[PDB]
């Protein structure tokens, strides 16, 4: 049949908060499904705790539930929405896992919910390691010498079999979660211990070593009629041994002969068929022995994956969209190919006339004591993608599109450093996130391709390419700016060289190369993505830049254009929130009659979706790249305020280069972004800020510090997420973190701010139209000032702040909006101490709190602010009064500490969270409990609690202890805490520190004695002393709080039921009058 009749309503399982290994790919996936079905006359219901996603846009689906993704909770949704089918394949592991528990718990059965896309057996068939392995053998595919383990004793015996090194892979996990490479016995237990615990099925799949073989993936889609296609093939740059998610990869595969491809392809299909996937798309990964073509099957993912998003963006083939439709019985032949103007069927294999490159994005600098070597467990936080007609072209663009300060192959070591070959050696032998740059350094240093291959195992096909760019680079360095004739320059542009790299090499200014290009008439052409290698025409404008002959840009002369600049790869501190805003700005303006142009190169985004804007330039967000498009688009205006720090830093340069920047000005952005300038503004306004000073050098800083007084906060200019920020306690604390602060400061000063003890933190998002100021929302933080806003939980409305004081802040915001010339969105940060408002900072753009506030207030701020930026006032839009919802909304974050065990899971001024969840309640307590549960907290309503607090918290601890007692907890405390509690009349049970005796905390935590841990610290040394409670609490999965306010909140949550009642966003919004 065609689309199914017995199914009207569908429940799409979202993936939750973004975490390492499980990110934006699904929002992209989820949102695709949602649109697919709805376009197909289906009632769509979807659940997702993440407020920053687009998918949770109320106008996206018929029923939107921003609820904790718990089977009990999901249960209640089913119960209330009476869904027909459930699509559990667009939410990663969270979704599969949930779909399966609903099933386990007979909830599906209970309500007649049909499981579509993929069945539960299929899923298990693939998700289960033993089972999978068994299928492989049955269909004659080869797999790596293994064994299954359900215990440690059993894992030991399989290890004593396969040998070291060996590869650990748990069942029902992904992102290499709970896995790794055991090179010895010691490593072996630690990894297995983790995997076994991590495993939903308490099962590990242990393999022998295939390290260094080639690694490949294929994306397949299968229909109900049995039709099967390879959507994309992928060849990894980094060899087997480095998770694909942490590897540089390219499409299509490059070094297989047709004969090997076919084998791989057949296998891919054989595998889907064997497992049971009939109505979707899956990813099949393989290992290939370069020496002999020997093929080995690594695994299968019975859902959409991160490669699907990449694969989709790479071919123009809408994987998730198609698959969704396929799950309701549509067949491939039935479905039309989007991009070719529905001229052809979706049943075909894409062919591309270019090279796609993806490089992962890391944040190791935020996790000091972490192991920064790449392995089988994912550590990256984002990814960039680039398109070029050649690999060289592709790769270089990606390098510059990553936003890590690279112009391409910038050098890591000096040529005249004796120890240089040794560092290179290491970096190559044992991959770090920095490998690619070291590989170039190796060529500069005198190592051969072979020499490099031996250390890296990276195919020479790639290597020679990098060596060739190096040689070209050395030529530029020799001949200099004089040698930059058109022929040569042209050749350089063709190999992907950026004006900026050429500039450093030629020891000139980037603006000089660009000028030279101008002279010569050396500008790129734009090609289009079309799924077929130009066999058919496309009416879509999805383009990439290249240096060739023919241009396919064909720009409108017709309308007024508006350019939106994207945020590039996701990263800690700048994530999905910024995509959501971009998408909305386009949606808005487009609706308003403007031609919308998107510039971005993050594949996992909805913004890089061809449906999204009128025009899409899949390009690096750089000055050079943007200038070129502008040159041809000749837009009405450009928005630089909705894509993070990037476009923010580019502003000045753009305007200076004639770009028509709309909304808040570049000077204005600089007033806010420059700490000294901000400091003045506050002064000129007669506002309150702490005791501070702006500094450029240590000695002076040291001197000034004496003045301000410790402790003090080091805050660089032009950063978000608290990059390089640190609380200093003395001189030497200062000298140690100063340079780093400067290094990221953007030729702008570093602020030295006196630390504000026992102060409440507040965030305020507002819109200014030059006429009026619209307050979006005031959010009070749970954690105090000192804990980064992005890592704090928060409430809307405020839950403890006086009206009087909030009103004081609303005014400061307005005063600031106006003085600073804000035009569109702004985010204000304050600290409340002693009934005194203090200004921390102003973010002259859309902030990460925007999506949440919008969701909480029912006001689409990104849309509104986008309109204001384009000319339409608040008055005109009729959005003039601040909304104060009837319910509470609480945001909670998810932290990656569990991916980086060697890290102290302490909170601070520098942001480290990767995602967030939203909790909505009748009370603050209800809101919090919901936030806490959706954040995947292990908190229990009973048990034994451990209390170990610092001096300052010695007063409120009693109240806290009391509260736990009234709840039925049993207390344990360490020495000092026990003393105070004793004095209050509370007699905890004494527990020995680690240096005190035995059993101690570690022992007791480790034994599972506790269900809650409240541990607060203060000072560098006292922190490093208590590190073990934190690390153990984490490892053992015990809920812990590191702030008293945090603990108090937890306490409250104890009086609520997160599973009690559920409410759609449509319904929340309707309750607003």
């Amino acid at each position: 049949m065609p689309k199914r009749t017995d199914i009207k309503s569908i429940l799409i399982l979202g993936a939750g908060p973004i975490v390492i290994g499980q990110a934006c790919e699904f929002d992209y996936s989820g949102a695709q499904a949602c649109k697919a079905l709805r376009e197909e006359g289906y009632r769509v219901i979807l659940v997702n705790s993440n407020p920053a996603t687009i998918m949770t846009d109320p106008e996206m689906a018929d029923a939107t539930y921003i609820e904790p993704i718990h089977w009990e909770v999901v249960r209640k949704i089913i119960e209330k929405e009476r869904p027909d089918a459930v699509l559990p394949t667009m939410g990663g592991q969270t979704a599969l896992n949930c779909a399966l528990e609903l099933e386990r718990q007979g909830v599906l059965e209970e309500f007649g919910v049909t499981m579509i896309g993929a069945t539960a057996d299929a899923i298990d068939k693939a998700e289960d390691r033993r089972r999978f392995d068994v299928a492989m053998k049955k269909i004659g595919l080869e797999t790596a010498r293994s064994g299954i383990a359900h215990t440690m004793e059993e894992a030991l015996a399989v290890a004593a079999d396969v040998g070291f090194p060996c590869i650990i892979r748990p069942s029902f996990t992904m992102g290499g979660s709970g896995g790794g490479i055991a090179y010895n016995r010691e490593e072996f237990e630690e990894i297995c211990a983790r995997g076994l615990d991590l495993s939903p099925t308490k099962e590990l799949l242990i393999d022998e070593s295939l390290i260094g073989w080639k690694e490949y993936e294929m994306e397949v889609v299968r229909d109900k009629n049995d039709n099967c296609i390879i959507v994309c093939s992928i060849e990894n740059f980094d060899a087997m041994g480095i998770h694909t998610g942490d590897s540089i990869t390219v499409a299509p595969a490059q070094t297989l002969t047709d004969k090997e491809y076919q084998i791989m392809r057949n296998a891919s299909m054989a595998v889907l068929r064997e497992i049971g996937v009939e109505t979707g798309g899956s990813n099949v990964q393989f290992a290939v022995n370069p020496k002999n073509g020997r093929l080995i099957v690594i695994e299968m993912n019975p859902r959409v994956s991160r490669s699907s998003a990449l694969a989709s963006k790479a071919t123009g083939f809408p994987i998730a969209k198609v698959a969704a439709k396929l799950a309701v019985g549509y067949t491939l032949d039935e479905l039309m190919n989007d991009i070719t103007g529905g001229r052809t069927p979706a049943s075909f294999e894409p062919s591309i006339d270019y090279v796609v490159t993806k490089i992962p994005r890391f944040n190791f600098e935020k996790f000091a004591g972490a192991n920064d070597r790449l392995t089988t467990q994912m550590k990256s936080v984002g990814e960039v993608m680039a398109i070029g007609r050649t690999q060289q072209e592709s790769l270089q663009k990606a390098l510059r599109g990553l936003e890590v300060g690279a112009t391409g192959f910038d050098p890591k070591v000096s040529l005249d450093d004796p120890e240089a070959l040794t560092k290179i050696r290491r970096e190559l032998k044992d991959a770090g996130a920095d490998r690619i740059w070291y590989i170039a350094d190796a060529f500069r240093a005198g190592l051969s391709v072979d020499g490099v291959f031996n250390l890296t195992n990276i195919d020479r096909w790639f290597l020679v390419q990098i060596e060739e760019l190096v040689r070209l680079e050395e030529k530029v360095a020799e001949v200099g700016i004089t040698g930059l004739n058109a022929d040569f320059l042209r050749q350089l542009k063709r190999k992907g060289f950026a004006d900026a790299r050429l500039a450093k090499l030629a020891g000139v200014r980037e603006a000089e190369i660009r000028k030279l290009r101008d002279q010569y008439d050396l500008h790129p052409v734009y090609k289009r993505v079309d799924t077929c290698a130009a066999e058919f025409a496309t009416d879509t404008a999805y383009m990439y830049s290249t240096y060739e002959e023919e241009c396919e840009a064909n720009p409108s002369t017709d309308r007024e254009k508006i350019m939106v600049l994207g945020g590039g790869p996701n990263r800690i501190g700048q994530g999905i929130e910024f995509d959501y805003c971009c998408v909305h700005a386009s949606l808005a303006l487009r609706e308003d009659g403007y031609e919308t142009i998107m510039v971005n190169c993050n594949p996992e985004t909805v913004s890089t979706d061809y449906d999204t804007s009128d025009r899409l330039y899949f390009e690096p967000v750089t000055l050079e790249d943007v200038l070129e498009i502008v040159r041809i688009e000749k837009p009405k205006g450009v928005i630089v305020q909705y894509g993070g720090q990037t476009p923010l830093k580019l502003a000045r340069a753009l305007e200076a280069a004639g770009v028509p920047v709309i909304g808040t000005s570049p000077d204005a952005i600089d007033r806010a972004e420059d700490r000294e300038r901000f400091q003045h503004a506050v002064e000129r306004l007669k506002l309150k800020q702490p005791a501070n000073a702006t500094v450029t050098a240590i000695e002076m800083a040291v001197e000034k510090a004496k003045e301000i007084g410790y402790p003090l906060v080091v805050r660089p200019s032009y950063v978000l997420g608290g990059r390089a920020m640190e609380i200093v306690y003395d001189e030497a604390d200062l000298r140690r973190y100063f340079q780093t602060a400067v290094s990221v400061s953007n030729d702008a000063p570093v602020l030295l701010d006196h630390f504000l003890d026992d102060a409440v933190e507040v965030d305020v998002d507002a819109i200014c139209d030059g006429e009026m100021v619209l307050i979006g929302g005031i959010m009070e933080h749970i954690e105090q000032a000192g804990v980064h806003s992005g890592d704090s939980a928060c409430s809307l409305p405020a839950y403890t702040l006086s009206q009087e004081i909030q009103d004081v802040m609303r005014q400061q915001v307005q005063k600031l909006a106006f003085e600073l010339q804000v035009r569109g969105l702004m985010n204000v940060q304050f600290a409340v101490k002693n009934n005194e408002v203090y200004l921390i900072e102003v973010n002259p753009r859309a902030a990460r709190t925007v999506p949440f506030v919008s969701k909480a207030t029912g006001v689409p701020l990104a849309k509104v602010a986008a309109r204001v930026m384009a000319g339409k006032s608040l008055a005109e839009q009729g959005v003039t009064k601040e909304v104060i919802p009837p319910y509470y909304s609480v945001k909670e974050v998810v932290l990656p500490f569990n991916k980086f065990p060697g890290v102290d899971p302490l909170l601070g001024p520098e942001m480290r969270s990767t995602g967030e969840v939203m909790g909505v309640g009748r009370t603050f307590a209800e809101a919090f409990a919901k936030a806490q549960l959706g954040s995947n907290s292990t908190m229990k309503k009973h048990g034994r609690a451990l209390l170990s607090v610092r001096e300052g918290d010695k007063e409120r601890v009693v109240d806290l202890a009391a509260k736990l007692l009234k709840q039925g907890f049993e207390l344990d405390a360490t020495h000092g805490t026990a003393i105070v509690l004793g004095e209050a009349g509370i007699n905890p049970r004494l527990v020995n520190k680690v240096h005190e005796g035995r059993p101690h905390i570690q022992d007791r935590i480790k034994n599972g004695e506790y269900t809650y841990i409240i541990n607060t610290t203060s000072g560098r040394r006292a922190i490093e002393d208590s590190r073990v409670i934190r690390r153990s609490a984490l490892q053992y999965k015990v809920h812990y709080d590191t702030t008293l306010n945090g603990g108090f909140a937890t306490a409250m949550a104890l009086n609520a039921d997160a599973t009690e009642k559920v409410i759609s966003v449509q319904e929340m919004h309707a309750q607003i009058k």
């Binding site: 049995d226 296609i229 490059q254 070094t255 047709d258 032949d333 290698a533 023919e550």
Partner: protein, 379 residues
Amino acid sequence: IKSALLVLEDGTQFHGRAIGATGSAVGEVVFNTSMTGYQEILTDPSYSRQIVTLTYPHIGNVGTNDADEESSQVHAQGLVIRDLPLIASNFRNTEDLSSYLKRHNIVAIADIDTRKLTRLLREKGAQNGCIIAGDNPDAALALEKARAFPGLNGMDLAKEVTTAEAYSWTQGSWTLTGGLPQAKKEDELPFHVVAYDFGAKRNILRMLVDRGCRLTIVPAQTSAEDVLKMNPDGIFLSNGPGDPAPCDYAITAIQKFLETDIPVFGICLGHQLLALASGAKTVKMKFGHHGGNHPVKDVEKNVVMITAQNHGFAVDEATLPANLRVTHKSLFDGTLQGIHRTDKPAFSFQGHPEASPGPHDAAPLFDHFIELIEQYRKT
């Protein structure tokens, strides 16, 4: 610096780099969307008098090897690519592409906007062109030679590539593990097929042999009479270059076979010939079909298959004799891909069930043929 230049009939120039032999090449220019299997493509006889342009920028990444030869030589008139890799990197590699091209004395160019070329051909249809590689290539001379090209329209190329003396093939298919197998002993082959050589790919033969046939290859012009005289268990009509139309001899003869109850199978040209022999009409397409991602529908089972295509001509559906029933169509342009005789035990496929290179999807088309054969044997 070694130049090369490609000039199209329309005057359009592509300047690039020489990557093969020195000289000139003239033919009908075509684009191929295959991402892999460039060598197999090169050694495909149907490409004779054709200057092949590959859409996938990097061509030569895996080098070349003898097993990847579909014929004894390179048939392509010329080679047009975007980028010739620095190195070949594949365990199966024996000779880098450049070397191979030179050795085969193939004029080849690199570094041109293949995409722009593709769009042109797709937009304005096939064109003849000329590639000149050498010191100072003469753009006006190139144009001249291109312009002067006759045109594959009405060009019988089958006669030009066919075998001189008929021969026997008993060799099976390649394996990763074993590579190309050793020829089999005739006695190991149940069936006995007679194959017209219209410029056949080795993979057709191997796959046949693979299915239990012992082969006897005959020149295109061989008489049905001469044929029938060997008592073949089935006849087969290969792929090949040029217009199928002009091949009266083969037409004539096929007509003569369809009077008998022998099973017959035609691939590509053979398809066209048989359709011709059935009184159907053949057209020359705008740009044709050349790739390995072509969806084809088995109208009968309403099942889709990804196929390997290579054809500049096609059979007119709206002129099909009733005795002719459509088995297959292209999902890209709805063109006719497969036919079967209502009355006889004769059918054909427009694409290449044998792939090489390409998806294995349509290989069952062979099985039908084996059914038809064991049936005539029962008889």
